[PDB]
Amino acid sequence: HGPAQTPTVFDKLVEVTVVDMNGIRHRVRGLQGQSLAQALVEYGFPDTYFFPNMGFYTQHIVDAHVFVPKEFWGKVQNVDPESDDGLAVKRMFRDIVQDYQRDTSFFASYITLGAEHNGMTVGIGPIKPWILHSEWAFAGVHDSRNKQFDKPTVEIW
Amino acid sequence: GVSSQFFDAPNGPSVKQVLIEDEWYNRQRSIFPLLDKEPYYPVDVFVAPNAVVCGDVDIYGGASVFFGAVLRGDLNKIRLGNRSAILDRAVVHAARAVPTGLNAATLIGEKVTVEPYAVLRSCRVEPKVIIGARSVVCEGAVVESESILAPNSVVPPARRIPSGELWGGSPAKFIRKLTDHERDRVLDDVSTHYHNLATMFRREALEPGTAWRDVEAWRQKLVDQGEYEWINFREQKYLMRLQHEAEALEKLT
Amino acid sequence: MFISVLLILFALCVTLIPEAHYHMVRVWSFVATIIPMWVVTWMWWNFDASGHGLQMLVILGRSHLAFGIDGVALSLMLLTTVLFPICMMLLRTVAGFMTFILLEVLVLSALCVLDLLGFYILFEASLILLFLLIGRAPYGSLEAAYKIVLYTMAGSLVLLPTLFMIYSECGTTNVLYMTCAYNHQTVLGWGLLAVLAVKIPLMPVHLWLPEAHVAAPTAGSVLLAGVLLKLGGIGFLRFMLPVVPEFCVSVFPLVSTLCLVSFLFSTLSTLRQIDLKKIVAYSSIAHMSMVTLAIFSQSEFSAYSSSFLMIAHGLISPALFLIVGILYDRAHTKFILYFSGLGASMPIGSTLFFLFTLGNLAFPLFPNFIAEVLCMVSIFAVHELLAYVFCVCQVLGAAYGFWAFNRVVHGLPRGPADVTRTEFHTVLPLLIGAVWLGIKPMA
Amino acid sequence: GFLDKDSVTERVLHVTKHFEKIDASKVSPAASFEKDLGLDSLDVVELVMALEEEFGLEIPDAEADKIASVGDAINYICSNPMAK
Amino acid sequence: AAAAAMIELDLCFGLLLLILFGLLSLRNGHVSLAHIRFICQCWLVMITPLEVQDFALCILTVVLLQSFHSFEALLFLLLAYIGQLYMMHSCNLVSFYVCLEAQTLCVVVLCGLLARGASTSFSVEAALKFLLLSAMVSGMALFWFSAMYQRTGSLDMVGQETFWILLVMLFKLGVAPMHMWSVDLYGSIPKSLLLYLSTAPKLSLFTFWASSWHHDFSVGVFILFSMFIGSIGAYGQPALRSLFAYSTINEIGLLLLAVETAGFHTLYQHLGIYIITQLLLWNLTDKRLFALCAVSLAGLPPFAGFFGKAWIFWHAMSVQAFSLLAAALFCTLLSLVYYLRVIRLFWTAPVHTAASFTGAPNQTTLTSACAVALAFAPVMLVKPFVI
Amino acid sequence: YKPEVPGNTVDNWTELRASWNKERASSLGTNYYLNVAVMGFAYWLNEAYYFPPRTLYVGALVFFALYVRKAYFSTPYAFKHEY
Amino acid sequence: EAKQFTPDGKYMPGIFSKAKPLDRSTQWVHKNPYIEA
Amino acid sequence: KSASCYAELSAIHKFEQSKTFEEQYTESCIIKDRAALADPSNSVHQMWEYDSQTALVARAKR
Numbered sequence A: 001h002g003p004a005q006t007p008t009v010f011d012k013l014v015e016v017t018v019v020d021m022n023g024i025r026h027r028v029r030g031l032q033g034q035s036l037a038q039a040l041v042e043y044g045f046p047d048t049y050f051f052p053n054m055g056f057y058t059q060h061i062v063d064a065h066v067f068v069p070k071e072f073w074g075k076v077q078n079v080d081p082e083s084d085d086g087l088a089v090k091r092m093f094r095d096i097v098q099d100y101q102r103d104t105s106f107f108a109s110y111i112t113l114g115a116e117h118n119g120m121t122v123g124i125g126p127i128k129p130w131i132l133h134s135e136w137a138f139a140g141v142h143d144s145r146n147k148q149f150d151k152p153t154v155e156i157w
Numbered sequence B: 001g002v003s004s005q006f007f008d009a010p011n012g013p014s015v016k017q018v019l020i021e022d023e024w025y026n027r028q029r030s031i032f033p034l035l036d037k038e039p040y041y042p043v044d045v046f047v048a049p050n051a052v053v054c055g056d057v058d059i060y061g062g063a064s065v066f067f068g069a070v071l072r073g074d075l076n077k078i079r080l081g082n083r084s085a086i087l088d089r090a091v092v093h094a095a096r097a098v099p100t101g102l103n104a105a106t107l108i109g110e111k112v113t114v115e116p117y118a119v120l121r122s123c124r125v126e127p128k129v130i131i132g133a134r135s136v137v138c139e140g141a142v143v144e145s146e147s148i149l150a151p152n153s154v155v156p157p158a159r160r161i162p163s164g165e166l167w168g169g170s171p172a173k174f175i176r177k178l179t180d181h182e183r184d185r186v187l188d189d190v191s192t193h194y195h196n197l198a199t200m201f202r203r204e205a206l207e208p209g210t211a212w213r214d215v216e217a218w219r220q221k222l223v224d225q226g227e228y229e230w231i232n233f234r235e236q237k238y239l240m241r242l243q244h245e246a247e248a249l250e251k252l253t
Numbered sequence C: 001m002f003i004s005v006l007l008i009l010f011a012l013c014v015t016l017i018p019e020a021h022y023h024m025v026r027v028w029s030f031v032a033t034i035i036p037m038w039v040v041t042w043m044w045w046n047f048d049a050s051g052h053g054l055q056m057l058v059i060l061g062r063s064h065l066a067f068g069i070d071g072v073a074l075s076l077m078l079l080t081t082v083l084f085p086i087c088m089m090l091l092r093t094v095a096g097f098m099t100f101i102l103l104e105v106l107v108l109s110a111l112c113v114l115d116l117l118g119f120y121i122l123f124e125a126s127l128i129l130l131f132l133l134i135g136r137a138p139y140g141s142l143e144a145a146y147k148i149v150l151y152t153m154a155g156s157l158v159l160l161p162t163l164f165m166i167y168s169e170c171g172t173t174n175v176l177y178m179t180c181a182y183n184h185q186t187v188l189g190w191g192l193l194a195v196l197a198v199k200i201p202l203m204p205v206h207l208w209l210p211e212a213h214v215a216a217p218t219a220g221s222v223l224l225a226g227v228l229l230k231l232g233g234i235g236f237l238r239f240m241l242p243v244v245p246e247f248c249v250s251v252f253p254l255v256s257t258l259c260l261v262s263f264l265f266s267t268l269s270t271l272r273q274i275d276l277k278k279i280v281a282y283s284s285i286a287h288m289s290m291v292t293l294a295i296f297s298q299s300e301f302s303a304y305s306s307s308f309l310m311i312a313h314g315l316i317s318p319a320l321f322l323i324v325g326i327l328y329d330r331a332h333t334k335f336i337l338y339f340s341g342l343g344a345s346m347p348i349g350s351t352l353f354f355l356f357t358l359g360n361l362a363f364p365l366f367p368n369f370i371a372e373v374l375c376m377v378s379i380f381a382v383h384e385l386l387a388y389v390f391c392v393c394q395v396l397g398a399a400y401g402f403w404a405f406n407r408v409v410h411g412l413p414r415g416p417a418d419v420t421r422t423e424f425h426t427v428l429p430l431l432i433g434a435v436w437l438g439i440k441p442m443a
Numbered sequence D: 001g002f003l004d005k006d007s008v009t010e011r012v013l014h015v016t017k018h019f020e021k022i023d024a025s026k027v028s029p030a031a032s033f034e035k036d037l038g039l040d041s042l043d044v045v046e047l048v049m050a051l052e053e054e055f056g057l058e059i060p061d062a063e064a065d066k067i068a069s070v071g072d073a074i075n076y077i078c079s080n081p082m083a084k
Numbered sequence E: 001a002a003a004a005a006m007i008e009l010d011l012c013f014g015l016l017l018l019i020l021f022g023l024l025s026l027r028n029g030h031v032s033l034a035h036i037r038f039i040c041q042c043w044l045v046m047i048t049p050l051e052v053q054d055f056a057l058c059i060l061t062v063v064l065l066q067s068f069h070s071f072e073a074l075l076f077l078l079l080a081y082i083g084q085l086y087m088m089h090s091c092n093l094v095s096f097y098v099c100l101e102a103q104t105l106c107v108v109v110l111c112g113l114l115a116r117g118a119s120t121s122f123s124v125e126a127a128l129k130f131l132l133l134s135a136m137v138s139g140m141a142l143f144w145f146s147a148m149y150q151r152t153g154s155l156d157m158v159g160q161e162t163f164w165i166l167l168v169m170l171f172k173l174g175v176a177p178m179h180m181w182s183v184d185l186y187g188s189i190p191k192s193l194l195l196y197l198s199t200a201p202k203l204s205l206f207t208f209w210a211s212s213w214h215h216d217f218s219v220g221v222f223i224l225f226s227m228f229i230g231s232i233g234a235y236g237q238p239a240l241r242s243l244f245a246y247s248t249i250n251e252i253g254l255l256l257l258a259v260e261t262a263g264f265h266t267l268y269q270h271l272g273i274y275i276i277t278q279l280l281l282w283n284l285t286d287k288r289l290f291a292l293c294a295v296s297l298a299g300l301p302p303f304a305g306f307f308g309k310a311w312i313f314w315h316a317m318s319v320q321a322f323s324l325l326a327a328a329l330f331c332t333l334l335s336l337v338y339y340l341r342v343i344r345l346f347w348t349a350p351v352h353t354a355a356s357f358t359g360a361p362n363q364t365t366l367t368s369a370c371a372v373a374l375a376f377a378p379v380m381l382v383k384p385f386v387i
Numbered sequence F: 001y002k003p004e005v006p007g008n009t010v011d012n013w014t015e016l017r018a019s020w021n022k023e024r025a026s027s028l029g030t031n032y033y034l035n036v037a038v039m040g041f042a043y044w045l046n047e048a049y050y051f052p053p054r055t056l057y058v059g060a061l062v063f064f065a066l067y068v069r070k071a072y073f074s075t076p077y078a079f080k081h082e083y
Numbered sequence G: 001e002a003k004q005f006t007p008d009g010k011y012m013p014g015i016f017s018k019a020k021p022l023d024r025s026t027q028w029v030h031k032n033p034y035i036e037a
Numbered sequence H: 001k002s003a004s005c006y007a008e009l010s011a012i013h014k015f016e017q018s019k020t021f022e023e024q025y026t027e028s029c030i031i032k033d034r035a036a037l038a039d040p041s042n043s044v045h046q047m048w049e050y051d052s053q054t055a056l057v058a059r060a061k062r
């Protein structure tokens, strides 16, 4: 231990360029170890962009459909397609995305921001109408100014 | 200068404004909204009678606000985690923006204790953190999970305290690493102890109590003398809005 | 009965104490388990040994739940009331105190019930408590909790229609009239075998124990090993042998081969274990197999010898779990490769470990020696070879016991310091009970 | 990187080829619209509209105003997450 | 002489006065209607006869009306109650058809009316599917009633055509494999109508079955389908609404096992315990009591759900219905896993309960705390009580 | 210690995406066809309750062995342009 | 060289102290990765 | 900027603080009526139109 640098937030900052569904580019800052869906929520994106992670014991996690370029395909975390997490991802692809799926389609909670994501450009993918319960649904149209960040709780019930 | 009347308040303009020097008793609310920003709190919260919680504030679970503490959410949002304790006369504020470019809301994780006379402004405090007394954590700074800040310490803006360590000084430097038992049990112990003290205070509170009897006696005496004024506040708010609209229309053309 | 209501209501007052008074919470929860130990000792004082088989009876009308005392229930109740304050000394939260208090109520009422439906209601009402105790969030294992709960539920669900079958057959589930009526013994015998072969770990329905008894905390392991396995034995001795004896004769070759293969295969598995808690956990299966065969022999004084082995196991194996729990609490591992030379660094703990190792291997001056001799007298009187199988395999138990002791106690001294006053007094009542019951057990 | 850097390049050359005021052999994979190819703003807008027609996009006025080169157009199409 | 029909005239006069009172109250701009709800509850008490089942339905509907706030919803629930009450007294297929169709129309309209937010179109979609599926079942009932009427010349419910009427009744209880309308309804429609749908019509239809129905057939394959499909579906579906829909299919399979072996006393005991648990389930604000519903729907011993399952098992073993009983025991072993998932979700978690801001502070703590005392009912359940 | 996820992330994620690039049908067709099947043909099982139990048990095991699961169901016919 | 007791008893936690306190986790083993695997 | 920001903040805080008890109680009753009117199935929504800030009947809708 010596005269080495004091830790700053700028050492742990990750910048991601996000293109929303209107084509507008956005600058999104996050921290290392934070997932991508959390940084998207804290940036101030509307609540129609997000949906529950459809696994058991993880519906309190919000998730988004993102398009990831081929260079950053290998930095998405690995999911066993035979495990229960794999069936959760399969349920999300079956029910939420459907025929908006591309070869670049991932889910934003499965991306953990590190230094390798610095400068990565992603885009928000479209989703189909869905319902979890009466207090959390999506009718299909992204016409709402309510941010996801302003919701005090994520309710599974 | 800024006027003190708001015609676009959610519940309308203020019909009767009382000067503070004309008040004969203390009317300070402990939980109150600022225009359209209402605080959010659970059923088992402890808010001390001389503490102030105003604006856009979210409180969760078994959190507590002790005597004389201020949580002012007027420029941004403040979030207080599950079983997090704000001790006596500590201040939590938030700026509109931070130099790092991140969200400027003050976010406090669960099981976080903040010792007396400490100040948090637009900082990020992760779960299980002890902030010492007379300590300041500035705008955009980050305190990581399972870490301890010694008393009378300054964390300058956009600075970071790494996880699992004890830091202290002005400016804050490395002191030592926490033991594994300290990270496993002691931080939760401090948070649980202060929650137990808050529960002891919560059990003995008679709300709303009986201090209103004197003020009601004075109002009864005014009704006896015929000097109590009955004001139709809804109709006065309606008429004031109509007059404001007419005055706005009678100047553009 | 009035006393039992008062003890329950005194025990349940732990929740109403404000949590900021730490000393009062500790003292109240410890005294709430000390008092039933005094009451059960008084019940032993009140017992007439030249009187009736069932004494101190009480029946609560038409609600089932009828109670009475015999020798097996009384000895097991004394052992449970000893074991529960030691569990109170190993917990730190009000949630733990309340879970163990509810468990003590259910165990004590289940040990002396005389109604089969009452036994069903009282025993497996502890299932959700065991699930929460084993699958606790940061340091438990949800897989183990799922295994123990699902195996117990499977056995209980096999029993429940046969219980109701004899209830419709004769009109009651009271064991005094179930033993005197004509019933279809094959069906009810299969239901009772299904519950009690899961409670007692008998192969093949035994795989829940190695996961659950290791994933549990030290207090949970003390309770599960020393108490809850013996509910299968008292199930055999109180309900199955008196009510379906024709089945109990006809199933004897099958129960006999299950006991023999459980003993041999579980002893062979214990030798390859590399976890100290898993070593202690497997050794209990062979002892319970000897208990079950001694119960089913029905030959000389079979209830006496089998109850005495249940008491000797319930004294010796919780102490081994306590020593492993000390090592885990102050070294954060249960792995044999991390421990060596514990004689030089914990001389008192290693001495206690050696004495309880010798006790677990049924050496003399321990109650296990008298127990295994009398159990083999009961087994020998049916046939000599069924005794010979247990006699010749004694080298296999001593192999794992001395190998585990020699690997962790001798060698290069590394590991934690010696025991504290609190750890010594958690161990101490079991040692005094062992010395008494192994030297002068009777008068 | 949402799409490859070769097929987009030859598609760019293919739609640059059919311009009457351009030279079918002077077009290079890395050139300029102003100094090299000799185009004013309206010709640039026409070329960007042809690129939009071929790749099925919508490029706003500021983004198309920033595009001044063949390499700039290829990089903008490659960076676009909604390309075809 | 019409002197034996004053309760019917009272029903009609009360409806005529209640509509006019609701009109007068709305002409004043009243944004709350607790006075209308009290008059509705009084009308419910005043039209109900002095039988056990009739008053069980009456008290249930009085409790249910505290979760409904508009005038039209209260009117629809009253006119659904008329069908629910008079179906228990129906001794023909004429009144049976009219009562069932009134109930179906009321449920469809309420599903359309009460939806709000982003879930409005999902609720309307599920209501349309339910209406279309209900129309063809109503057509099957009418067609086979016409067949029976032509064959017998009378209104007796005898012969081979009663098998299709039985299938109509099994549709109305959500019995698998005709179960998916209820699964669709559980995923979108709000909690108050889900509370209404799981309690009152099952009571009404089972009382009609107990009172005036005989068939010469079996329902065993539908017992097997309901129990296995409900248990496996609730094991496999991560959304909680679908979990409770499939667990409801499992419970109706157990009630059908009680019907099939005769012995309606165990049916009535299990149905009452289930209805009280439903009243607790859909009015919960503190999530720790969600674990009590879990341990009392898994049949765990000291709580009342154990007793409700265990008399069904006892009477099934009494008449030696061995194969259906074995299937029921296997599905009971499976049900414990997802009720433990419920306990993992809502008991081993930090406690957060938001306070009220616009008044009405935790407005149904009385009913939920009263229904949690299903741990004290087992003392009365062990006795010969329900017979 | 944590176990390693088996496989490659790109290959696993392509396996997760497979056969779901299609609009899901509404459930009204499945529900209507189930109700038609029960209301038209469930009377064929009326005499089956009196058949010997070996036949009934083997038939139940046969129905379990030939059952195809509705969840995660996919056909190759969904993505081909000719039979 | 920590001081966790006053001269008249009275345990002190030493939360903000520089010296490392001796406690329950003082003798926890250093994990070998291959043994854990 | 800091001085101007606190001038703007002190205006809003003085506006909230200097309301009488009668105004605050009337505002709580208005908040209650507004939350009762947030139900789209409320039976008054088909006849009356309500003022947003006071929850009074402004006009007939039909």
Ligand SMILES: CCCCCCCCCCCCCCCCCC(=O)O[C@@H](COC(=O)CCCCCCCCCCCCCCC)COP(=O)(O)OCC[N+](C)(C)C
Pocket (backbone or CB within 6 Å): C044, C047, C048, C049, C050, C051, C052, C053, C070, C071, C072, C074, C075, C076, C078, C079, C082, C303, C304, C307, C308, C311, C428, C429, C430, C432, C433, C434, C437, C441, C442, C443
């Ligand atoms: C089936 C018979 C029961 C035997 C079970 C084995 C008991 C284990 C220890 C053997 C002690 C023998 C004691 C003999 C004299 C005591 C009184 C007596 O007679 O025993 C009672 C019951 O005895 C007991 O309850 C013995 C209690 C033993 C439990 C000891 C373990 C608990 C102590 C733990 C350590 C405490 C240390 C604390 C100090 C710090 C009745 O048994 P029987 O004589 O068979 O009954 C006669 C039958 N009939 C009425 C029909 C004529």
Ligand SMILES: CCCCCCCCCCCC(=O)SCCNC(=O)CCNC(=O)[C@H](O)C(C)(C)COP(=O)(O)O
Pocket (backbone or CB within 6 Å): D039, D040, D041, D042
């Ligand atoms: C359906 C068809 C209907 C069509 C009707 C619409 C027709 C509208 C035409 C009338 C609008 C005009 O001419 S607008 C008048 C355009 N002329 C000017 O503004 C004077 C300055 N010269 C320029 O701007 C030149 O474009 C240039 C030197 C190339 C600048 O080079 P760049 O470009 O690099 O910038």
